[PDB]
Amino acid sequence: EKRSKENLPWVEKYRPETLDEVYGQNEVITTVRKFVDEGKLPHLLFYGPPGTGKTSTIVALAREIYGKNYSNMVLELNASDDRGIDVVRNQIKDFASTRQIFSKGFKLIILDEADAMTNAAQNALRRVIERYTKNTRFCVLANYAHKLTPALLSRCTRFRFQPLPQEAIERRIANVLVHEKLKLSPNAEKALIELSNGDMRRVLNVLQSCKATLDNPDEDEISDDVIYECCGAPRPSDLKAVLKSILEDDWGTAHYTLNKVRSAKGLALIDLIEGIVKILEDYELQNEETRVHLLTKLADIEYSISKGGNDQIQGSAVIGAIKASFENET
Template sequence: MSSKHSEKNLPWVEKYRPTTLEEVYGQQDVVDTVKKFVHEGKLPHLLFYGPPGTGKTSTIIALAREIYGPNYRNMVLELNASDDRGIDVVRNQIKDFASTMQIFSKGFKLIILDEADAMTGPAQDSLRRTIEKYTKNTRFCILANYAHKIKPALLSRCTRFRFHPIPEQAIQERVKNVIIKENLKLNEEAEASLLKLSGGDMRRALNVLQACKAALETEDDEIDTKMIYECVGAPDPKDVETVLDSILKDDWTTAYKTLNTFKVIKGLALIDLISGFIEILNKFELKSRSRIEILKGLSDIEYGISKGGNDKIQSSAIIGVIKQAMENEA
């Protein structure tokens, strides 16, 4: 397989993974600080935490490239801390890796531990001891989604960096580059929906865009809002609005029919409808009592659905909650 061919088949999240720290978008504070560490030659153990798709793995890999150059792989060990073969396997890999280094290198090696928040308490203790043991010639970078799932004793040995959801503007900049490189046509509304639905997750933005391209009938077609929603698997806001409108204005039976029709024909899930309703209702001017009533009612129903509650009953309950709260408004 030629390299050109393999690049073509690469998922875009890999194809467009940042290779330098400059290409990490929307995490300026983190990037500036870790760069400073490197240039001062004082890299501490690191903890990167934050939501998925915000650049934790990308940043540490780009940093490794910056430190070691293109052959960084020899100096970096990437492990999944939640490896289900257990912490002993992880520990042995670290031991092998850390102890081979003195032979040919003076600098430190880098060990990246992904999904550290999935580790059990005892595994974290064991990791803490391992880190202490090899601190002389290795640096650890722990990656996690939630810092509160990491034990304080481990936390206190790392310099912590929070990766926040990537600002829409930064996602937009990155996406614009991809649109040009991939020769895509995206209208303005579709781009705005893409940014909104990404929710600060660059991985999602790229995956949705790639799925949309795959769904195009001919390469010249334009990607529109509807396609974006379909590729995300989120309901089209226009559909959500129609259903809500019917609940607000029509009698019970008609509202129930509308909701059901959209559920069946458009494949809308109740749970998505609830999020959509809340988003729209948040923009309404309501008495705070009604607002609280709606939010409380809908969140109870959402919980019921997640516990496997009967769909028909939950559908009626949604209509009931909204209609009743609106009666207070009148």
């Protein structure tokens, strides 16, 4: 790196260093801590969605086992490094079959993002894992479990990293606010958690952008409005008004309301579609075909939007689909 840690992005500045700084995965953290505290470390696998703390957890565990010099006592490989059959057959085998250079102890191999590895390399890894288990332990990290071969999964003990809970996100936000000398409104925190979707990376990025947005962060307070302008996301009031107009007004009024709401702050149609879907999924529809039509048509519109197209036609299609689907309610 260069200069102090204050030059780093918040996603990297607040990376957990120890195992007590990881939040939202209490069960997994406790289990791994107990395993490391008694020498009962098996071949580990961490399966989870993006931005949940798998890499942070494994690096913290390696630091706990070895110490500050963990980088000189582990073999860490990821998607940026070639991991072909030759690599598995030579480099990994040599690392697993040899003693530590610096200080005594067992050998740890961290194959981060192993789901990117080919089937041949994973197959070659089988006996490598099973033969040097006396002195070596393997850790695998994955987001998609369908890419891993059945045998490799069979040889590993699985741990699932759940989407981050609300309480853990609030505690981390409190720590970040205290360190950064920031003030966050309760509704601002609510909006941040809602838009995070269980990812701490999104929380930290949005909070950094909000801090940048404030003119005088020293005594200014971050409000839900700041989040909405920073992210460009529709306000809940805007979504509610659009849905109300679509559901109990004529086509002209609905079109005018949608256009005005979108042009007030330059909102995107995709965010509106997601918001309306979230609102409608809480509705109690009398008829199932209403929900079926809503889901099918909105999914089609979302797929069409994903490839460009005409924005006005797409908005009119959204309005018409909602109206037609709700006509079935009677």
